[PDB]
Design an enzyme around this catalytic site. Structure first.
Site, PDB file in Angstrom:
ATOM      1  N   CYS A  19       0.820  -1.350   0.068  1.00  0.00           N
ATOM      2  CA  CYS A  19      -0.068  -0.276  -0.265  1.00  0.00           C
ATOM      3  C   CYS A  19       0.753   1.111  -0.142  1.00  0.00           C
ATOM      4  CB  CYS A  19      -0.924  -0.039   1.020  1.00  0.00           C
ATOM      5  SG  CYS A  19      -0.178  -0.376   2.806  1.00  0.00           S
ATOM      6  N   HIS A  30      -0.191   5.835   9.248  1.00  0.00           N
ATOM      7  CA  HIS A  30      -0.945   4.671   8.787  1.00  0.00           C
ATOM      8  C   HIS A  30      -2.229   4.115   9.535  1.00  0.00           C
ATOM      9  CE1 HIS A  30      -1.626   0.873   6.433  1.00  0.00           C
ATOM     10  NE2 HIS A  30      -0.760   1.192   5.542  1.00  0.00           N
TER      11      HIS A  30
HETATM   12  N1  LIG Z   1      -4.004  -2.171   4.414  1.00  0.00           N
HETATM   13  C1  LIG Z   1      -4.018  -3.397   4.200  1.00  0.00           C
HETATM   14  O1  LIG Z   1      -4.901  -4.392   4.860  1.00  0.00           O
HETATM   15  C2  LIG Z   1      -3.175  -4.144   3.066  1.00  0.00           C
HETATM   16  C3  LIG Z   1      -2.784  -2.925   2.113  1.00  0.00           C
HETATM   17  C4  LIG Z   1      -1.885  -3.835   1.359  1.00  0.00           C
HETATM   18  C5  LIG Z   1      -1.432  -5.061   1.191  1.00  0.00           C
HETATM   19  N2  LIG Z   1      -1.726  -5.798   2.506  1.00  0.00           N
HETATM   20  C6  LIG Z   1      -1.389  -7.194   2.429  1.00  0.00           C
HETATM   21  O2  LIG Z   1      -2.329  -8.031   2.049  1.00  0.00           O
HETATM   22  C7  LIG Z   1      -2.208  -9.383   2.475  1.00  0.00           C
HETATM   23  C8  LIG Z   1      -3.747  -9.622   3.472  1.00  0.00           C
HETATM   24  O3  LIG Z   1      -3.701  -8.284   4.284  1.00  0.00           O
HETATM   25  P1  LIG Z   1      -5.327  -8.448   4.833  1.00  0.00           P
HETATM   26  O4  LIG Z   1      -5.314  -7.071   5.709  1.00  0.00           O
HETATM   27  O5  LIG Z   1      -6.419  -8.628   4.025  1.00  0.00           O
HETATM   28  O6  LIG Z   1      -5.255  -9.487   6.161  1.00  0.00           O
HETATM   29  P2  LIG Z   1      -6.690 -10.408   6.608  1.00  0.00           P
HETATM   30  O7  LIG Z   1      -6.353 -10.802   7.841  1.00  0.00           O
HETATM   31  O8  LIG Z   1      -7.832  -9.626   6.561  1.00  0.00           O
HETATM   32  O9  LIG Z   1      -6.813 -11.540   5.749  1.00  0.00           O
HETATM   33  C9  LIG Z   1      -6.120 -12.600   5.257  1.00  0.00           C
HETATM   34  C10 LIG Z   1      -6.972 -13.748   5.192  1.00  0.00           C
HETATM   35  O10 LIG Z   1      -6.222 -14.893   4.720  1.00  0.00           O
HETATM   36  C11 LIG Z   1      -6.594 -16.066   5.537  1.00  0.00           C
HETATM   37  N3  LIG Z   1      -5.706 -16.904   5.825  1.00  0.00           N
HETATM   38  C12 LIG Z   1      -4.750 -17.125   6.554  1.00  0.00           C
HETATM   39  N4  LIG Z   1      -3.759 -18.140   6.162  1.00  0.00           N
HETATM   40  C13 LIG Z   1      -4.492 -18.891   5.311  1.00  0.00           C
HETATM   41  C14 LIG Z   1      -3.997 -20.187   4.814  1.00  0.00           C
HETATM   42  N5  LIG Z   1      -2.950 -20.640   4.966  1.00  0.00           N
HETATM   43  N6  LIG Z   1      -4.875 -20.527   3.527  1.00  0.00           N
HETATM   44  C15 LIG Z   1      -6.037 -20.042   3.180  1.00  0.00           C
HETATM   45  N7  LIG Z   1      -6.644 -18.536   3.743  1.00  0.00           N
HETATM   46  C16 LIG Z   1      -5.552 -18.101   4.778  1.00  0.00           C
HETATM   47  C17 LIG Z   1      -7.325 -15.584   6.698  1.00  0.00           C
HETATM   48  O11 LIG Z   1      -8.358 -16.453   7.464  1.00  0.00           O
HETATM   49  C18 LIG Z   1      -7.877 -14.322   6.497  1.00  0.00           C
HETATM   50  O12 LIG Z   1      -9.127 -14.259   5.964  1.00  0.00           O
HETATM   51  C19 LIG Z   1      -1.270  -9.293   3.606  1.00  0.00           C
HETATM   52  O13 LIG Z   1       0.060  -9.695   2.988  1.00  0.00           O
HETATM   53  C20 LIG Z   1      -1.075  -7.820   3.832  1.00  0.00           C
HETATM   54  O14 LIG Z   1       0.321  -7.445   4.041  1.00  0.00           O
HETATM   55  C21 LIG Z   1      -2.726  -5.385   2.947  1.00  0.00           C
END
Ligand SMILES: NC(=O)c1ccc[n+]([C@@H]2O[C@H](COP(=O)([O-])OP(=O)(O)OC[C@H]3O[C@@H](n4cnc5c(N)ncnc54)[C@H](O)[C@@H]3O)[C@@H](O)[C@H]2O)c1
Ligand SMILES: NC(=O)c1ccc[n+]([C@@H]2O[C@H](COP(=O)([O-])OP(=O)(O)OC[C@H]3O[C@@H](n4cnc5c(N)ncnc54)[C@H](O)[C@@H]3O)[C@@H](O)[C@H]2O)c1
Ligand SMILES: NC(=O)c1ccc[n+]([C@@H]2O[C@H](COP(=O)([O-])OP(=O)(O)OC[C@H]3O[C@@H](n4cnc5c(N)ncnc54)[C@H](O)[C@@H]3O)[C@@H](O)[C@H]2O)c1
Ligand SMILES: NC(=O)c1ccc[n+]([C@@H]2O[C@H](COP(=O)([O-])OP(=O)(O)OC[C@H]3O[C@@H](n4cnc5c(N)ncnc54)[C@H](O)[C@@H]3O)[C@@H](O)[C@H]2O)c1
Lengths: 334, 338, 334, 335
Positions: D150, D177
Site C-alpha cells: 500500500c 498509517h
Molecule cells: N491495508 C491493508 O490491509 C493491506 C494493504 C496492502 C497489502 N496488504 C497485504 O495483503 C495481505 C492480506 O492482508 P489483509 O489485511 O487482507 O489480512 P486479513 O487478515 O484481513 O486477511 C487474510 C485472510 O487470509 C486467510 N488465511 C490465513 N492463512 C491462510 C491459509 N494458509 N490458507 C487460506 N487462507 C488463509 C485468513 O483467514 C484471512 O481471512 C497481507 O500480506 C498484507 O500485508 C494489506
C-alpha cells in the site's frame, strides 16, 4: 508464601500478577504462555489502559526478575507437560481461555499443581465463585474452581440484594461492554464462527451472547432460571456497565428504597456511588461491581412495576481483584 | 401553478447538511437557501466532505452570495436571529429548523415572522405543536399547522416498534435503553459543558456515557394510547454514528413467543420500518433510510411460570434514519397545503 | 507559600492544580472559569485519560475545598475584573487560550496580580521558556511570561543537542499529535475557519499547523529560522510524538553518536529510552520530552546525510510538569 | 474470461472480489480461506469501512452465489492441495499474508494455477509492480509477481516525479498509517514478536517498520538506496498518509513547481487535490496515491533546501485498485 503459577500471561494473567504483588501470602513463581521472555517482560512493564508497572522488570536466564524476585517462564501449549511438581506449585491461575472445563484444567493437576482457579466460567463438576457473594461455599478441598465472569461479578451482588430485599420474580440484563481479545481488529473470519465478533471491534456496537444472567444460578441458586440477557460490545478498551430490568414481589417500590438497599450491602467487592461517572472513571478500580444510584429507575403503571438498575465494572481490574480475593481465600482454607 | 417546494435550511450542521443531501434525491423539494454562523467556503467544504456519510456526489462551487450545487444556486446567510432572514423575498414554503436553538413553538415562530409559511423542527420541541414520526402518526397533520416537530432520532426508532407491541399484544409497561452514537452536544475532551451536564462534559469518543432521553417518557405525543407506559435513557458510546434502541416490556397477551413478536414486526414493515434477520452491527446501518430497523436476531422472551418479559431491539442511523424521516414529513406537510 | 490563581480550569489548568498539590511552597488559592462549582469540582475529581484525583474534593460556599484547603472560584470572562489584588495573587497561570498575548495578559496585572505565566505561545514583548533548556534566561523581573507549547517542550532539548554537538543546518518537523479541545466532536463549522479542525477529531488523521519549529528561535536563538513543520492530529486522546528530520554540519554522523549525545543530555525534563514504547505509555509522564533511541535514523548518500529523530510527550502532563517547574522557578526569583 | 482464484478472503481479498466485478473479462471462480461459507458470504455483504455490497449474495452447495455467478469455496491451509488444475485457474490472487515469497507461492503453480500475483511485498526472484509506475516491466512470461505494498503504491509516483523533474539526492519518509489486521485488539503477545504490533491497535500511536522507502529500487531502480523511513500506526480503521522529506539537485525550488509537476503526472493511479481533506475522505478511493498540494513545504536556509510532500492512500481500496489493474494487465499479456 503460597506458590502461584499463571497459565496465560494475557490481560487477566498480567493484571493478576500485578495484584498478587500487593497481596502478602501469595507469590507468583512461574508463568506460562506462547512467547519469548522479552515479550512477557515488556507487556508486564507497559499496559495501554492500566498504566506502567510500578517496580523494576528485567529479563534473566530462564525468565524475568521482578523487584529482585525471579519468575520462571515457560512456553508450553500443553498444560500436562508443565513442571508444576518440580516447582511445587500450590495453585495455578488458569487464564488462557483454553482450559475452561474441569476435565481440561485437570491437566495442571496431572502436571503437579495442587489446585486450579480458572479465570472464566467453566463447565463440569466445579464451583463457580463470585467473591463476597458465594465464596463461603468453598471449604478448601476443591481441586478445580471457577472465578466466574467479569459480568457475573458485576451482576451477582446486585441480583442478591434485589432478591433478598424485594423478592425477584424475573429479570432481563444488557451489559454495555468494553471490547476484548476475542474480537477482531478488522472485519475478518472469526475462529468460533461468530459473525458479530468477526467485525472490527473498535468501530462498532456489537451484540453478543453472555452467560452471566442465564447462568446466575451457579452463584445464586435461589434465583436459578429467573434471569437472562445479552451484551453489546462497544469501542472502549476497558470499562463496562451492566443494566438490569426486573419484576419484583414487593409492590410500590421506590428508587430511594432500591438505592438504600444497595448502599447497605456495600463492601470491598460491591461499591456504591451517587456521582455521575462514566466508563473511564472505573478503569483500574478494584470493586467487582460499582452500583450507580444515578441510573436507578422505577416504572409504575397501576399496581405493576419494572425496576431498572445499573452497575459499573472494569472487566479487567474489577474481575482480577475478585479473582485474587478468591485465590487468597482458597489458599487460606487449605 | 405547481412548483417544487421551496425549502430553507436553518443550521447547516449534521442533520441540516444530510437533509440537504437527501433533498437532492427527492423530487418536488428544493433547497433555495441555507443559514448558519460561518463562511461559504466552510459550508461548501462540509457539504462536500463527510467523515461518516461519505463524499457528496454532486459538484459544489462557492459563488457570490452562496454556493452552486450541480449548477443550481443556493443562497447562504450568516444570521443568528431567524426573524431577520429574507424568507419573504425568497418565497420560502418550509424552514427545516436544525440549529438546536429554536426547539420551541414561540421561538420557531421567528421564521414565520420572517416570511416562511411553515417550520419543521429537527428535534423534540416545547409549546402547543404536533410531534410527528412519519408512518406512525403523520396522518394527524391536517394542513393547518405552521410549526411542527419531527420528533427525535430515538423516537423515530422506537415508535413503530411500540405501536406493534401495543396493537398486537397490548402494552402494559416498558423500559428502554438506547445505545447511541456520540453527538455534537458532547465535548471532545473533558471540559465544562454549556448546559451543565457533568456527563456530556466528558470526552465523547473515550467513554460509555449515561444520559437522559425523552423518547420513551414522551412517547404519548406520538402514540397517545400508550402515554405514560414507557420510560428509559441513553448510553452514548464511541461510534460516530449508528445507534440501537433496546426495549423491555410487559404485555397483556400471555404465552408470547419470539416467533410471534418477529412475525408481527415483519408484517408491519414499510419504507420507515425495516426488518432484518442478519447479524449486523452498527456500521451496517450508517446511511440507511429506514427510520427504524427491527433486528429479529435480538428478540428475547423471558418466561417464569405465567409471567413474561419481552425484549426487542431496533437499529437506527441517528443521522440518516432521522433525516430520511424528517424529509418524508417535510414532503407530506407541504403536500397538505397545495 | 506562593499564591497561585488559575485562569481557565481546563485540561492544563486542572492538571496544573494536580501537580501543584505535589509542590511545597506553591498553593492554588483561586480559580476562574465560565461554569458552576459542581462542574469544576467534578472535572477535578474525574479525568478520562489522567485518572481519578488522589485526594478528596468538596464543593463549598466560596468555591471548593481540596484536602482541607479552600479554593475560591469566579466567573469573569474579562480577567481585569478579577479580585487578584484583594487575594494577593503572586502568579496567574493563564490557561484559557484567550489571553495569549502580552497586552491581553496584562489584564491580570491590572486586576492586581504580580506575574502572569501563559500556558501557550504568546505574541508580544515577552520571554518564551522551556524548563531545563532556557529557564536560566529568567531573572525574576518579568511580569508576563510564556511557558511555550507542548510541542516546543518536546522539540527544544532535542534541537539543542543536535546543534551543540553536530551543528544544525536546517530541519523539518512533524508531530503526530493527540486530538485536543480546539477540534470538533463531529464535522461542524469551526470558530477559526479551519476546515481541518472542523472535522470529527476521533475519526480522522488531520493535518494542521504548529508554531513549534518556526518559532524555535524564541527558546534557542542560535537556531532561529532553521526549522519548520506541522502536525498530524490523530485519534488518541492524549500522548504525542515529535519527529525531526535535519541536515547537520558534521559529516559521517551515525545513529550511535546521536543516541549517545541525547543520553548524555538527559535530566528531569529530558528523558531517554531504548524501550519500544507506544503513545499510551507516556500518558501521565513528567518528562517534557522523552527521546526514543529506537527511532533514530541516518540516511547517507555520498557525503550528504539526513538525520531523523523522534521524542514522545504527553501534550497534557509533560507540558504541565514543565509549566509548573517554570512557575516554581519564576516565583523563587525576583 | 480470465479465471481468478482468491487465496485469503480477507480485507484485500474481499475488496479485490468487489473490484473484479468492475473489470470486464476477469472472473473470480474460486475462493480459499480458513472458515465456512456462512462467514465468507457475510463478510462480503457487510463491510465496516467500505460499506454494504450492493449485489445479491447467497450461500449455495459448495460455495456462494454473487449476482448470478457461482463461486466455489475451499478451506485448505496448504496451497499445494488446492484444485487449481481442475478449476483451470489462470491467476491466483495471493492475499493470505502467509505466501509472501517466490518459492512458497510456487505451491499454487504446483497445484495447477498458471500465475500468482501476491498482494504484498515478497522475497525471492520476482518482479515488484506498482501499476502506472513500472507495470511495463512485465512481459507476460512471469509466473509469480508481487503487487508491492500500500505504502509503495502511495510513494512511487511521487518519488518518480521528484527524481525526474528535480533530481533526487536522498529522502526520509514517515507514513501515518491506519491500523491493520497484523495488530492486536488488546495488548497481547504478538505472533511475530513485534513488541509494538503487540499493543492495542485502536488506542495507540505505534511506530513500526516499512520496506516502502528502503526497497523503492525494486520499482524505481534509478533511486535505489536513496530513500528510507518507517510508519506510525494510528487509530483510524482505514486511510493513510505518506510524508516524504527530500533533498533535491534542482535549486531555488518552490511549492508551486513541486505541485505543478505532480499535477502534470496525474492519471487513474495518481490523483491530485488542493482541498483540505482528512483521512476519512479517501476511504474507498481508487487512486493508488492522492497528492495533497496543501501539504507541500519548502524550507530554505541560504541556498540549502529541504522539500516536504504528502500523499493520501486508502491502504485498503487504493492498493486493491492498483492490484487489480496489475492483475488485468498481467492477464492481458500472453493472451
Ligand atoms: N491495508 C491493508 O490491509 C493491506 C494493504 C496492502 C497489502 N496488504 C497485504 O495483503 C495481505 C492480506 O492482508 P489483509 O489485511 O487482507 O489480512 P486479513 O487478515 O484481513 O486477511 C487474510 C485472510 O487470509 C486467510 N488465511 C490465513 N492463512 C491462510 C491459509 N494458509 N490458507 C487460506 N487462507 C488463509 C485468513 O483467514 C484471512 O481471512 C497481507 O500480506 C498484507 O500485508 C494489506
Ligand atoms: N475483560 C476481560 O479481558 C476478561 C474478564 C474476565 C474473564 N476473562 C477471561 O480470562 C481468560 C483470558 O482472557 P484475556 O482477555 O486475558 O485473553 P488474552 O488473549 O489477553 O490472554 C490469553 C493468553 O493466553 C495465552 N495462551 C493461549 N493459549 C495458551 C496455551 N495453550 N498455553 C499457554 N498460554 C496460552 C495467549 O498467548 C495469551 O497471552 C479468558 O477465558 C476470558 O474469557 C477475560
Ligand atoms: N444524531 C443527530 O445528530 C441528531 C438526530 C436527530 C435530531 N438531532 C437534532 O437536530 C438539531 C441539530 O443537531 P446536529 O447534530 O446537526 O448539531 P450540529 O451542531 O452539527 O448543527 C447545528 C448547526 O447550527 C448552527 N447554528 C447554531 N446556532 C445557530 C443560529 N442561531 N443561527 C443559524 N445557525 C446556527 C451551528 O453552526 C451548526 O452548524 C439538534 O436539535 C439535535 O437535537 C440530531
Ligand atoms: N495538549 C493540550 O491540551 C495543551 C498543551 C499545551 C498547551 N495548551 C494550551 O493551554 C491552553 C488551554 O488548553 P486546554 O486544552 O486546557 O483548553 P480547555 O478548553 O480544555 O480549557 C480552557 C478553559 O478555559 C475556560 N475559559 C475560556 N474562556 C475563558 C475566559 N475568558 N475566562 C475564564 N475562563 C475561560 C473554558 O471554560 C475552559 O474550561 C490553550 O492556550 C492551549 O493552546 C494545551
Amino acid at each position: 508464601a503460597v506458590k502461584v503459577a499463571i497459565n496465560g500471561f494475557g490481560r487477566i494473567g498480567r493484571l493478576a500478577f500485578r495484584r498478587i504483588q500487593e497481596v502478602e501470602g501469595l507469590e507468583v513463581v512461574a508463568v506460562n504462555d506462547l512467547t519469548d521472555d522479552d515479550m512477557l517482560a515488556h507487556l508486564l512493564k507497559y499496559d495501554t489502559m492500566q498504566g506502567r508497572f510500578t517496580g523494576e522488570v528485567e529479563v534473566v536466564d530462564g525468565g524475568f526478575r521482578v523487584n529482585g524476585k525471579e519468575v520462571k517462564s515457560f512456553s508450553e501449549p500443553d498444560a500436562s507437560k508443565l513442571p508444576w511438581k518440580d516447582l511445587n506449585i500450590d495453585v495455578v491461575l488458569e487464564c488462557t481461555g483454553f482450559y475452561t472445563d474441569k476435565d481440561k484444567a485437570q491437566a495442571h493437576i496431572e502436571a503437579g499443581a495442587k489446585k486450579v482457579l480458572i479465570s472464566a466460567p467453566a463447565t463440569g463438576d466445579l464451583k463457580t465463585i463470585v467473591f463476597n457473594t458465594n465464596h463461603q461455599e468453598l471449604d478448601g478441598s476443591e481441586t478445580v474452581v471457577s472465578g466466574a465472569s467479569c459480568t457475573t461479578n458485576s451482576l451477582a451482588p446486585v441480583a442478591k440484594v434485589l432478591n433478598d430485599d424485594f423478592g425477584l420474580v424475573e429479570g432481563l440484563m444488557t451489559t454495555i461492554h468494553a471490547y476484548t481479545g476475542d474480537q477482531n481488529t478488522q472485519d475478518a473470519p472469526h475462529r468460533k464462527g461468530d459473525k458479530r465478533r468477526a467485525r472490527a471491534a473498535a468501530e462498532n456496537i456489537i451484540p453478543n451472547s453472555t452467560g452471566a444472567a442465564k447462568a446466575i444460578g451457579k452463584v445464586i441458586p435461589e434465583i436459578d432460571g429467573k434471569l437472562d440477557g445479552g451484551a453489546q460490545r462497544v469501542p472502549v478498551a476497558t470499562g463496562s456497565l451492566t443494566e438490569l430490568t426486573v419484576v419484583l414481589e414487593k409492590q410500590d417500590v421506590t428508587v430511594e428504597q432500591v438505592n438504600e438497599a444497595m448502599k447497605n450491602a456495600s463492601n470491598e467487592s460491591f461499591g456504591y456511588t451517587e456521582d455521575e461517572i462514566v466508563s473511564s472513571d472505573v478503569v483500574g478500580m478494584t470493586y467487582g461491581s460499582l452500583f450507580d444510584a444515578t441510573q436507578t429507575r422505577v416504572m409504575s403503571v397501576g399496581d405493576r412495576q419494572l425496576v431498572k438498575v445499573a452497575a459499573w465494572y472494569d472487566n479487567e481490574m474489577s474481575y482480577t481483584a475478585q479473582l485474587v480475593r478468591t485465590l487468597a481465600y482458597l489458599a487460606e482454607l487449605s
